Design a protein around this ligand. Structure first.
Ligand SMILES: Nc1ccn([C@H]2C[C@H](O)[C@@H](COP(=O)(O)O)O2)c(=O)n1
Ligand SMILES: Nc1ccn([C@H]2C[C@H](O)[C@@H](COP(=O)(O)O)O2)c(=O)n1
Ligand SMILES: [Mg+2]
Ligand SMILES: [Mg+2]
Ligand SMILES: [Mg+2]
Ligand SMILES: [Mg+2]
Lengths: 223, 220
C-alpha cells in the first residue's frame, strides 16, 4: 500500500566511511547522522530556476559525526579518498565500534520523533548491511531494530521519472551545476545527499513513506 | 588530570539573556584531540588564511525545546523559536540528553576540557542549571572547562578592542564569520580562532583549565 509503516516523522541522512569495498569484509571508520523532521523538509524553499541554487539546509537539525578506530587497516584506495587511516585514528585516541557507541546512537535516535527512517546513498548494498554487521558483533541489541531505512538511489530514479548515472556526485552535478564538496567524508557526503533530497522534498517524502522497510530485515554484509 | 588530551569546543543558544533566566535551545560539541590542534599549520602572513579544520573530529549538534518562549531578540539572531522547535518534535533538555552527552564524552580520551566563548559567564553556568534540573548525575562532573575570551586576551597580549567572537575572527582573518549565532556555526568560528596559535592555546589551557564541577549555576 501507500503507508506500510505510517508517515515517517524524521529522515536520518546517513553516510559511512570504511576500510574497503564489500569483498574486503570492511569495517567502519567514520559515521555521520543528520536527522531532519518531515516538516523541515516539506517547508524547504521550492526549487525554481535553472540551475536552482543548492537548497539551504533546514535550520532545525540534529547532527552526529564520529570517527571510529577500525580493527584492521584501510586499503590503499580507501585510505586516500577518505583521508582516514587506522594509525591516524588510533594515535588520536578514537575508540572502536563498541557498546558505548550503540548507547550513543540509541540516545541520539531516541531524541527523534517516530517513526524514523534512515536515508543512505547505496545503503541497501553497502551502508545498511555494513552497519548491520557492526551492530551484530555487539552484546547490546541493535538500536535500529525499530528504525526504518531507504536507499536514496532508488528514491531519485523514481523521482526523476517525471516524464543516466545515479552516483552521488553525478546526481548532484545534474540537479545543480556546482561540484559536491568534501567528497568521501561522512559529514561531507551526508550534506551532499541532503541537498539532493531537498530538490523535490514532497515527492521524496511520498516515495520514502511508500518504500520504508525495517532496518531489522537488512542482511549483514558478512559474519 | 592536567595535561589535556581533548578540547571540546562548545556553544549554546538559548531563549534570552541571563537576567531572563533562559533555557538552552541548541547546543553543539566539537571534540578535537590535542594532536589535531598541535599539527595545525602555524599562522603565517597578514592576514593568515583561515586554518583548515582537522580531518579527525567528533561533532554533536542538537536542537532543544525550551520550557519558555524565546525572546523576540533571541529568535531574531538564532533563527530558533519554541514553536518551530516543538512542531518539529524537539524534546526538552531531559535525562536521555544527559545520557547522550555522557556517551559522547566517554568516546573522548581524558582529560578533556570544554572551550566556550564567554563560557565562564554564560554557557557553563547555564549548562550547570540545565543539568541540575535532572535526576541523572551530571556527566560533566570530571571534565574541565575554560573561557576562550580569557584565552585570546592572553594570546594577543603575548604579542605585540572587542573580544566578541566575531570581532576576534575578523581581526585575525580579515573577513566576516559565517552562520553567526547558531550553535554549530559559532563552534566552527571558535575553532578557527583557537587554531590561530594552537601551541600557545593548549599551553594556556593546561594552566587555566578548571573543573566544571566548580562552575556556579546561573539561576535556580
Ligand atoms: N575506490 C574505492 C571507493 C569506495 N571505497 C569504500 C571506502 C569508503 O569509506 C566506502 C564508502 O564510499 P564513499 O567514500 O563514497 O562514501 O567505500 C573503497 O574502499 N575504494
Ligand atoms: N543580542 C543577544 C545576544 C545573545 N542572546 C542570547 C541568545 C543566544 O542564543 C545566547 C547566546 O548568544 P550567541 O548567539 O552569541 O552565542 O544569548 C540574546 O538573547 N540577545
Ligand atoms: Mg556513501
Ligand atoms: Mg562517504
Ligand atoms: Mg556563545
Ligand atoms: Mg552561539
Amino acid at each position: 500500500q501507500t503507508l506500510p509503516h505510517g508517515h515517517m516523522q524524521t529522515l536520518i541522512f546517513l553516510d559511512l566511511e570504511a576500510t574497503g569495498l564489500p569483498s574486503s569484509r570492511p569495517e567502519v571508520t567514520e559515521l555521520c547522522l543528520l536527522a531532519v523532521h518531515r516538516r523541515a523538509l516539506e517547508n524547504t524553499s521550492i526549487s525554481q530556476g535553472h540551475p536552482p541554487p543548492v537548497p539551504r539546509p533546514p535550520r532545525v537539525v540534529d547532527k552526529l559525526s564520529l570517527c571510529i578506530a577500525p580493527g584492521k587497516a584501510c586499503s590503499p584506495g580507501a585510505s586516500e579518498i577518505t583521508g582516514l587511516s587506522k594509525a591516524e585514528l588510533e594515535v588520536q585516541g578514537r575508540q572502536r565500534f563498541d557498546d558505548n557507541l550503540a548507547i550513543l546512537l540509541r540516545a541520539f535516535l531516541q531524541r527523534q520523533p517516530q517513526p524514523c527512517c534512515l536515508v543512505a546513498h547505496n545503503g541497501d548494498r553497502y551502508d545498511f548491511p555494513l552497519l548491520q554487521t557492526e551492530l551484530a558483533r555487539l552484546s547490546t541489541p541493535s538500536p535500529l531494530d525499530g528504525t526504518f531505512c531507504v536507499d536514496s538511489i532508488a528514491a531519485l530514479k523514481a523521482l526523476e521519472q517525471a516524464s543516466k548515472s545515479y552516483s552521488l556526485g553525478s546526481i548532484y552535478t545534474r540537479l545543480y551545476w556546482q561540484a559536491p564538496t568534501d567528497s568521501h567524508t561522512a559529514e561531507g557526503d551526508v550534506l551532499t545527499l541532503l541537498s539532493i533530497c531537498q530538490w523535490k522534498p514532497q515527492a521524496l517524502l511520498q516515495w520514502v513513506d511508500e518504500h520504508a522497510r525495517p532496518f531489522s530485515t537488512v542482511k549483514p554484509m558478512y559474519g
